[PDB]
Design a protein around this ligand. Structure first.
Ligand SMILES: CO[C@]1(C(=O)O)C[C@H](OC(C)=O)[C@@H](NC(C)=O)[C@H]([C@H](O)[C@H](O)COC(C)=O)O1
Ligand SMILES: CO[C@]1(C(=O)O)C[C@H](OC(C)=O)[C@@H](NC(C)=O)[C@H]([C@H](O)[C@H](O)COC(C)=O)O1
Ligand SMILES: CO[C@]1(C(=O)O)C[C@H](OC(C)=O)[C@@H](NC(C)=O)[C@H]([C@H](O)[C@H](O)COC(C)=O)O1
Lengths: 181, 182, 186
């Protein structure tokens, strides 16, 4: 029942547009065959720090790329310095990776492969205000960058018209997925 | 318990939407003490709901998992029980620990009013995982009476948005939890 | 531990929206190491918010769970602690539940550098819920962590319930169940 996280109060640790322009808070907890996750994002500087209807595109991507031992690769948008188990860098986390059987890397109707199953899509709310919806898309194992064995990708965006600019500062989002091990 | 009861993570067609085995229901239930953590997704592979558009009616269908008092799946369920089993093909004998509580979610003076909302979980899912293709899911606990079931988990799937260009009914994954019987 | 803190299976009203015992809160918190897994639902049985429509204002109300530094529920909470205990002890109240409290590091109590900007969204979880569980009857829920200062609380979990859709025919404020998780204090 271990937890792999960014630490709960991270310094800027994540690239949206430029290095460390945002704070990703991400906690993964192993509940046997499923991982329970909570994620939130605050963009602190740059193009997406304060958004409005003039900003385009209205979506950006945060990639976590892992090798076959579940170690985060430096090509990830997330900086690995404080990505570790909750209390030395960790050696292995295959247990926390999204399953390549449930969520295979991209490649008879019984052989139709689902396009939806490897994604989780919901609204989040900017500043936690019910009248400031945006969206999150979590994707498992959809990346090919850096020859990753596994990947978790967060697409953040919005669609509602905001004429008065507001911080891109998401409510916390809970999700779960089938673990590799 | 941290045990998992599931369809297997990559099932063959295993579920009836319109006809038998016309879809692949991926469902994993993991026991976290007396709450179950669940993840569900649906891919309809053949028949009326494989490719939907505004001309298909009705725009909602029901998938019932019906259990006896040992938590064993009854064959009247929409889900085929052949590979519904604990993660580890001998069929399991007991899974009451994974059933929705009949105290928190009973089968159907202001102080004595009973909640109709609490046995349901309702949310959007997104076909193909695209933010512009919403559909919906309703998870219902213990609301079936079919086959003298002692427990039930029902998944209602549907959509409301107009889709003139047809799209596969291929849901994003949906997470939920519920109070376990024991 | 892997225990559960919940509203106990007594069927009486256990919560105050507007007046004492006008509502029935269902909440279960289950500890998964450093994360809490939760499910919450609310039925208002009497008073202003039992049956709602567009002529009811405001369209939001708040249910506060306030805890001391041992994780014990304070009597200033909207939830009547008569009905709040570990699931198992019927007459023995719990002494300690710090492990179920929302982290004050992840979710600090409210109080120049952009890099030191404090997230306003992170301590909230916001979603639709659906009245009666009907897909055409959306309402909303806002779960907030540690944002209260009432009663010198050490920790808090606040549920704001409301709705925005225009309703002509009155409908019971009877929410679908909502799952969420949060980072635990320890
Ligand atoms: C009017 O449209 C919206 C909006 O974009 O603002 C849609 C918005 O719903 C979504 C999914 O974006 C809704 N928010 C929630 C969490 O219910 C939101 C609220 O229901 C609404 O702002 C609440 O208003 C009142 C009267 O309390 O309404
Ligand atoms: C126009 O309304 C909709 C739609 O039917 O497409 C509603 C849709 O929201 C819902 C609850 O269906 C929304 N998707 C999400 C995940 O929020 C979706 C997104 O806001 C929109 O597609 C995103 O647009 C941009 C500019 O990225 O907008
Ligand atoms: C027309 O707008 C709405 C509504 O307010 O009723 C928006 C409503 O969505 C939201 C986010 O409120 C939607 N329900 C769901 C769960 O997606 C809902 C359903 O798609 C719609 O009611 C579907 O109709 C039936 C009965 O199948 O449509």
């Amino acid at each position: 029942t271990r937890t792999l996280w960014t630490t709960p109060d991270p310094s800027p640790n994540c690239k949206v547009e430029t290095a460390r322009d945002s704070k990703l808070t991400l906690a993964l907890t192993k509940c046997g065959s499923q991982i329970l996750a909570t994620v939130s994002l605050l963009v602190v500087t740059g193009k997406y720090a304060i958004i409005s209807d003039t900003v385009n595109p209205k979506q950006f991507s945060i990639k976590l790329l892992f090798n076959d031992k579940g170690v985060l690769l430096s090509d990830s948008n997330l900086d690995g310095t404080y990505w570790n188990y909750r209390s030395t860098p960790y050696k292995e986390a295959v247990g926390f990776m999204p399953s390549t059987t449930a969520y295979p890397k991209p490649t008879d109707p019984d052989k139709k492969v689902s396009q939806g199953k490897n994604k989780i899509v919901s609204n989040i709310y900017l500043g936690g205000e019910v009248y400031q919806p945006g969206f999150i898309v979590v994707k498992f194992n959809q990346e090919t960058d850096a020859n990753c064995a596994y990947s978790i990708t967060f697409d953040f965006g919005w669609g509602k018209v905001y004429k008065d600019p507001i911080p891109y500062d998401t409510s916390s989002f809970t999700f779960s997925y089938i673990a590799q091990e």
